[PDB]
Amino acid sequence: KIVNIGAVLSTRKHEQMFREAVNQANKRHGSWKIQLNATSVTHKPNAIQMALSVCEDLISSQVYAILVSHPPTPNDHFTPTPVSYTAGFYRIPVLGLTTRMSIYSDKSIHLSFLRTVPPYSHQSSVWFEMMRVYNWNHIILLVSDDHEGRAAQKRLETLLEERESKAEKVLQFDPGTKNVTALLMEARELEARVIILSASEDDAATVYRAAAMLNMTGSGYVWLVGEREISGNALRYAPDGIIGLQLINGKNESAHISDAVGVVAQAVHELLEKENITDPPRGCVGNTNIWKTGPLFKRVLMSSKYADGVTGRVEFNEDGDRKFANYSIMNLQNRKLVQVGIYNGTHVIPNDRKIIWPGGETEKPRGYQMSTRLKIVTIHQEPFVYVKPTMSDGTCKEEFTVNGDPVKKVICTGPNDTSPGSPRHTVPQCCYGFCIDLLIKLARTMNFTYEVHLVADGKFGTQERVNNSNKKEWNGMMGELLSGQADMIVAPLTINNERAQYIEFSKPFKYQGLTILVKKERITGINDPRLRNPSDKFIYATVKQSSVDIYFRRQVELSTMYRHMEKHNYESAAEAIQAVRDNKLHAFIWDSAVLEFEASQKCDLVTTGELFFRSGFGIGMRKDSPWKQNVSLSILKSHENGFMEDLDKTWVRYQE
Amino acid sequence: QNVITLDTSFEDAKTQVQLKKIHSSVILLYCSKDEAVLILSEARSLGLTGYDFFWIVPSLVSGNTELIPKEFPSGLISVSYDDWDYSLEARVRDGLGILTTAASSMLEKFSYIPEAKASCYGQPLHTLHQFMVNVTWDGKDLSFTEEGYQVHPRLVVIVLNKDREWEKVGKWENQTLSLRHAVWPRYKSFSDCE
Amino acid sequence: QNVITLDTSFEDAKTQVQLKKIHSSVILLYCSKDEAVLILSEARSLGLTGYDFFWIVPSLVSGNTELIPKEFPSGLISVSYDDWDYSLEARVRDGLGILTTAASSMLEKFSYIPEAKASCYGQPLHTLHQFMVNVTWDGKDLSFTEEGYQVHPRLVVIVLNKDREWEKVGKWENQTLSLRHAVWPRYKSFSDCE
Numbered sequence A: 001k002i003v004n005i006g007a008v009l010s011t012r013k014h015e016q017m018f019r020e021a022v023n024q025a026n027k028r029h030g031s032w033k034i035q036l037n038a039t040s041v042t043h044k045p046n047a048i049q050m051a052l053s054v055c056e057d058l059i060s061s062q063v064y065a066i067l068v069s070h071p072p073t074p075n076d077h078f079t080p081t082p083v084s085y086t087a088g089f090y091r092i093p094v095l096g097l098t099t100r101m102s103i104y105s106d107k108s109i110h111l112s113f114l115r116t117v118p119p120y121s122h123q124s125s126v127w128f129e130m131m132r133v134y135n136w137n138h139i140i141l142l143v144s145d146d147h148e149g150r151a152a153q154k155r156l157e158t159l160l161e162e163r164e165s166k167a168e169k170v171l172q173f174d175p176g177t178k179n180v181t182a183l184l185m186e187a188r189e190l191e192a193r194v195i196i197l198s199a200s201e202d203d204a205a206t207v208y209r210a211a212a213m214l215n216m217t218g219s220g221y222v223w224l225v226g227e228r229e230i231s232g233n234a235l236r237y238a239p240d241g242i243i244g245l246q247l248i249n250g251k252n253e254s255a256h257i258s259d260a261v262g263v264v265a266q267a268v269h270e271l272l273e274k275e276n277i278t279d280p281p282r283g284c285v286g287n288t289n290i291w292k293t294g295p296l297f298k299r300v301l302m303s304s305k306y307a308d309g310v311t312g313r314v315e316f317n318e319d320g321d322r323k324f325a326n327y328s329i330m331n332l333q334n335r336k337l338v339q340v341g342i343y344n345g346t347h348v349i350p351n352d353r354k355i356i357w358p359g360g361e362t363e364k365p366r367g368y369q370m371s372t373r374l375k376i377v378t379i380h381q382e383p384f385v386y387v388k389p390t391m392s393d394g395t396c397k398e399e400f401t402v403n404g405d406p407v408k409k410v411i412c413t414g415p416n417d418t419s420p421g422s423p424r425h426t427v428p429q430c431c432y433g434f435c436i437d438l439l440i441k442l443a444r445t446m447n448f449t450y451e452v453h454l455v456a457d458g459k460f461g462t463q464e465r466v467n468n469s470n471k472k473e474w475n476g477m478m479g480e481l482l483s484g485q486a487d488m489i490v491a492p493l494t495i496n497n498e499r500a501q502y503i504e505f506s507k508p509f510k511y512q513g514l515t516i517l518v519k520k521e522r523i524t525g526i527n528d529p530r531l532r533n534p535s536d537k538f539i540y541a542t543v544k545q546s547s548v549d550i551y552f553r554r555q556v557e558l559s560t561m562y563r564h565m566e567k568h569n570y571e572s573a574a575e576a577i578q579a580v581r582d583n584k585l586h587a588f589i590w591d592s593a594v595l596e597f598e599a600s601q602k603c604d605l606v607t608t609g610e611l612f613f614r615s616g617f618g619i620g621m622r623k624d625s626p627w628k629q630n631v632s633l634s635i636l637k638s639h640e641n642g643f644m645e646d647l648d649k650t651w652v653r654y655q656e
Numbered sequence B, C: 001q002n003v004i005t006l007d008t009s010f011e012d013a014k015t016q017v018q019l020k021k022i023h024s025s026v027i028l029l030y031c032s033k034d035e036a037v038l039i040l041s042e043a044r045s046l047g048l049t050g051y052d053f054f055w056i057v058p059s060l061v062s063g064n065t066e067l068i069p070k071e072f073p074s075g076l077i078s079v080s081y082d083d084w085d086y087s088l089e090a091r092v093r094d095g096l097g098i099l100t101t102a103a104s105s106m107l108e109k110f111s112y113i114p115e116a117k118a119s120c121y122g123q124p125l126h127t128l129h130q131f132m133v134n135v136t137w138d139g140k141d142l143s144f145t146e147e148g149y150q151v152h153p154r155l156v157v158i159v160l161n162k163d164r165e166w167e168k169v170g171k172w173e174n175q176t177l178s179l180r181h182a183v184w185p186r187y188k189s190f191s192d193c194e
């Protein structure tokens, strides 16, 4: 009765420590006839002969559990891989002791690998625990390493799924490149200042240099990294006040080997309690079959609970990782690594030392430096947003109304419609009218500046499917909203169901419905049954990728018109007005007050009598944001007085 | 409906509570072949194997075509890339076509591409790792992905009939499905108890 | 929705299909005691013991008020007549009153009213069976039907409270049902995990 245990080990002193741990494992574990034998191998510079030596030693040895504890002296990459693959061929368990790569967490590669150390991805758990201490909710994730950092990003999005509060922006790039300053500018432009990095040494030193070039060590900035960033040459160029994580006894090798041998020993003494016990044979002689109680012994190792340990209480999770590991939380007090906190698995306790921040005093960084400037996008709506080219040099002609009130114009930026069809300049331009003056009143109410720009292409924005993999995307003003290019859509935006699922809406400032523009012979709205089956004499359509398209796509009895007007959709409303003025159409489907304004302009343009889809123009907004309550309250304050009536007296009520 | 996982080898006490909430027709099951027999036996013991219901599994359980236990429901839909029309000879012919296409196309850029390692004892710019994307031999679009898979791979959609065997049903276009039978029958006889 | 029937002592295999047909709120249950325990344990396992899912059972399910068994949801509506107000002493006093009233009112019709059976070993017209259709003692309408029932008994509607007891809610008149709570009390914790 013997049990063979293999060990892949570095030194010669820890070989004696492994033999001493085998001797101590046979001390108090009963007078049973079982014994424990020790087998140790050393390094080779190339990994092929490492796997060759391991298989030639351990096929002849018939071991049960293999301990692998490679310290990376020449290279920090994938040295415990071959022993893991070799024993995972025969499904023999490998206990990794010094490696921490998250590629070992995926058991689709390593079928029979466990480890008594926690990987870097569970550091993200601590980073989630960094959010509950200071009540932080918006973070900026910068992942450098694409090898294992996607697993840490997935773990962070999994742990933030319980709060249902996503990160503000996640960024991924390639290790090795240096010029990553545009990523830093994208991290700059957002209101949050919490920066979370997981990287190797060299890319961390690169982004430390590039952040020192860009004032990112000042006040408000919060830097939160792991173990690989507080060492090497990255520690030489680390910004002061940084918060890092460190493994308590993570390189203490002797006690770690002893605790692993105790784990293996109690697993063996539990394995002898059961029957149907086999041995992994000499696999080099024609043995392609796996060891039959492989998953059984693996299930023993996964559910192996322990209360003994020199480092502490060791326990495996559902993925074979070290649970409830104590961490040190380190601060960099002017190029001095200072321990400022301890991490049990459920809670953080700081010590008597104070957490000196990267900025000025010891006050906590409320990392929401909210912007007084808001990116505003709108479309050229003729009764609402007049867009007109500048007079002399980027300036607007000061035009007066009928009462001598100066028209409050703004310097927006207007690109042309066809960028390859003509030399496209993207010149600034003048914006005024209804919604522009509403925005000027809103900026008059609350102290915030603004930058009005326009949409790249004249579409509101629809749920449009992209060609590869049939994936849904958004375009137009909503496509520029969700891409971060916009912050607040003040525009004639139609409220419906599909938009409010993704973005938020204020209370509507305009109440109107859909109606029909004709040339005057009665039509009498949508309830004319002859338009239900149209022909070449009923030529009518709507704006391409408008809200009318979605509203007619939902209602199934309006499908036939939806299968007609899809052949004649136009890019903008004014093109349809000019087409129906020359009698190239017969009707048009659009909102109420715009067509009433066009009827006030041109007497031949006639709106119909019926009315449907009584909805409201409101302000298109972002997600959870501090511009939800007071914007709606300011619109409602504009509704309770006669200011909306005065804006109607400017353009809506105004006849000609 | 909800996404139901497990914890351990089932006691049939609390995982049964997770299984009793299922009342919809189609069930996607993702588990190993050693687990799928027990899970489908628990589903059959709880009445989850009606002809109104449907069971679609990936290639994780559909391994050996010969090894079919009695607990597989007659009406199981699986997907595997094992094609009986393309044997091993056509596959190694396609592999040699990919290798010769990469060798003949990479030769047009730089000449001395093959540089093998000298020996396995005692330890490159132009590699085919970033050249394998644009390959087309004998009309077959055998292009590769960044994760190492195939862009247009050969899939096979099989069913389990009442004859307790696998029938090749669904073949594949460049992107979409081509069904041999647009009529989907009941496949009602799981056993005689229906 | 139509009446759900059970076949035999259930394996929780085929009757579960019948129980999954239920999408309504209130379910009426008419079975014996241990069958009610098994069906309510199944509905706990099926999640049919919710806030919207009400269960109204007769006195044949309950049996007695001094013994309240396990696996009853706290809010189980029962209709019985085992009341402490209509106590057992009052029960046997009313029974003696009915018997003496029948014997006295039949004594005015016929003289030799005591006519009993001799013995159980060794092997009638003026009987009390055809006489007490309309009998009344102490002003209580304790008349007897042809099928052996009280015409106007004391129907008591009880619920199971939050402390595993049966609280008296409703009493029943000759025509109306005198209730205590017009608004239905919730009894939110029918079980633990709700």
Ligand SMILES: *[C@@H]1O[C@H](CO)[C@@H](O[C@@H]2O[C@H](CO)[C@@H](O)[C@H](O)[C@H]2NC(C)=O)[C@H](O)[C@H]1NC(C)=O
Residues within 6 Å of the ligand: A002, A037, A038, A039, A040
């Ligand atoms: C117990 O382990 C020892 C040490 O690994 C084994 O002794 C080795 O046996 C091999 C057999 O080929 C010899 O080549 C080595 O010289 C021995 N060890 C040394 C000095 O390196 C021993 O065989 C094992 N005994 C068993 C079977 O339990």
Ligand SMILES: *[C@@H]1O[C@H](CO)[C@@H](O[C@@H]2O[C@H](CO)[C@@H](O)[C@H](O)[C@H]2NC(C)=O)[C@H](O)[C@H]1NC(C)=O
Residues within 6 Å of the ligand: A249, A252, A253, A254, A255, A256, A310
């Ligand atoms: C951490 O490194 C230290 C270096 O001293 C080690 O701890 C000691 O190890 C020796 C040899 O095993 C033991 O006799 C002592 O009991 C340990 N220190 C104490 C508690 O006095 C060890 O390699 C690592 N782990 C520990 C136990 O801290």
Ligand SMILES: *[C@@H]1O[C@H](CO)[C@@H](O[C@@H]2O[C@H](CO)[C@@H](O)[C@H](O)[C@H]2NC(C)=O)[C@H](O)[C@H]1NC(C)=O
Residues within 6 Å of the ligand: A342, A343, A344, A345, A346, A347, A348, A349
């Ligand atoms: C690490 O472990 C200790 C226990 O040793 C945890 O202390 C418990 O924490 C919870 C929540 O704060 C309390 O309700 C218990 O009363 C505590 N029990 C004891 C015995 O202390 C501690 O929370 C963990 N994390 C740290 C370091 O705070």
Ligand SMILES: *[C@@H]1O[C@H](CO)[C@@H](O[C@@H]2O[C@H](CO)[C@@H](O)[C@H](O)[C@H]2NC(C)=O)[C@H](O)[C@H]1NC(C)=O
Residues within 6 Å of the ligand: A626, A627, A629, A630
């Ligand atoms: C929205 O407007 C309200 C108007 O009351 C603002 O609330 C006040 O602002 C101060 C700012 O420090 C807050 O402390 C208080 O909640 C409010 N005043 C007091 C003393 O009651 C609110 O800040 C505005 N929110 C924004 C910025 O959109």
Ligand SMILES: *[C@@H]1O[C@H](CO)[C@@H](O)[C@H](O)[C@H]1NC(C)=O
Residues within 6 Å of the ligand: A179, A180, A181, A182
């Ligand atoms: C490369 O380096 C410069 C250095 O300032 C950086 O700003 C920029 O992002 C990169 N390319 C340029 C010159 O735009």
Ligand SMILES: *[C@@H]1O[C@H](CO)[C@@H](O)[C@H](O)[C@H]1NC(C)=O
Residues within 6 Å of the ligand: A213, A214, A215
């Ligand atoms: C950093 O801050 C200063 C503030 O005066 C400003 O010149 C600029 O934003 C940055 N200049 C550098 C690169 O030091």
Ligand SMILES: *[C@@H]1O[C@H](CO)[C@@H](O)[C@H](O)[C@H]1NC(C)=O
Residues within 6 Å of the ligand: A275, A276
């Ligand atoms: C254990 O071994 C016995 C004897 O070889 C065998 O009969 C039995 O099948 C095994 N255990 C199981 C799978 O029940």
Ligand SMILES: *[C@@H]1O[C@H](CO)[C@@H](O)[C@H](O)[C@H]1NC(C)=O
Residues within 6 Å of the ligand: A311, A312, A313, A314, A323, A324, A325, A326, A344
């Ligand atoms: C962490 O440290 C505390 C204090 O020494 C100890 O009680 C606890 O068991 C340790 N946990 C582990 C698993 O190291």
Ligand SMILES: *[C@@H]1O[C@H](CO)[C@@H](O)[C@H](O)[C@H]1NC(C)=O
Residues within 6 Å of the ligand: A416, A422, A423, A424, A425, A427
């Ligand atoms: C945009 O529009 C005009 C007319 O289409 C075009 O000539 C020019 O490229 C742009 N603006 C200027 C500079 O006129």
Ligand SMILES: *[C@@H]1O[C@H](CO)[C@@H](O)[C@H](O)[C@H]1NC(C)=O
Residues within 6 Å of the ligand: A446, A447
């Ligand atoms: C404008 O901002 C300043 C600085 O934050 C603040 O003092 C003031 O109250 C704000 N409101 C006004 C009056 O516009």
Ligand SMILES: *[C@@H]1O[C@H](CO)[C@@H](O)[C@H](O)[C@H]1NC(C)=O
Residues within 6 Å of the ligand: A466, A467
């Ligand atoms: C996808 O196809 C559409 C036409 O349906 C085309 O407009 C678009 O350019 C294609 N690709 C992209 C960039 O989505």
Ligand SMILES: *[C@@H]1O[C@H](CO)[C@@H](O)[C@H](O)[C@H]1NC(C)=O
Residues within 6 Å of the ligand: B134
């Ligand atoms: C692949 O090479 C061929 C050569 O004709 C041609 O289709 C094209 O240049 C390449 N296409 C892709 C996908 O790179």
Ligand SMILES: *[C@@H]1O[C@H](CO)[C@@H](O)[C@H](O)[C@H]1NC(C)=O
Residues within 6 Å of the ligand: B172, B173, B174
């Ligand atoms: C793939 O598309 C091409 C046309 O681009 C077509 O000739 C070919 O038949 C398609 N392949 C399949 C499998 O249908």
Ligand SMILES: *[C@@H]1O[C@H](CO)[C@@H](O)[C@H](O)[C@H]1NC(C)=O
Residues within 6 Å of the ligand: C131, C133, C134
């Ligand atoms: C009671 O019932 C008897 C028949 O058994 C009937 O003759 C009598 O009229 C009834 N009592 C009343 C209400 O008078």
Ligand SMILES: *[C@@H]1O[C@H](CO)[C@@H](O)[C@H](O)[C@H]1NC(C)=O
Residues within 6 Å of the ligand: C173, C174, C175
């Ligand atoms: C029914 O009810 C009363 C008792 O509440 C009873 O005395 C009488 O027989 C009946 N009266 C009516 C209202 O029918």
